[PDB]
Amino acid sequence: RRCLFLSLFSFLIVLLLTTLFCLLHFGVIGPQR
Numbered sequence: 001r002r003c004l005f006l007s008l009f010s011f012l013i014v015l016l017l018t019t020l021f022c023l024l025h026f027g028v029i030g031p032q033r
Contacts, residue, residue, distance in 0.1 A: 023030055 024032055
């Protein structure tokens with residue numbers, strides 16, 4: 001059931017999100033909340 005290929009693409013989305021989401025939450029220099 002679990003697709004090892006689709007899963008690999010998921011890690012890229014989870015990381016790409018944590019990059020911006022962290023900058024928005026932490027309020028580093030761009031708190032666009």
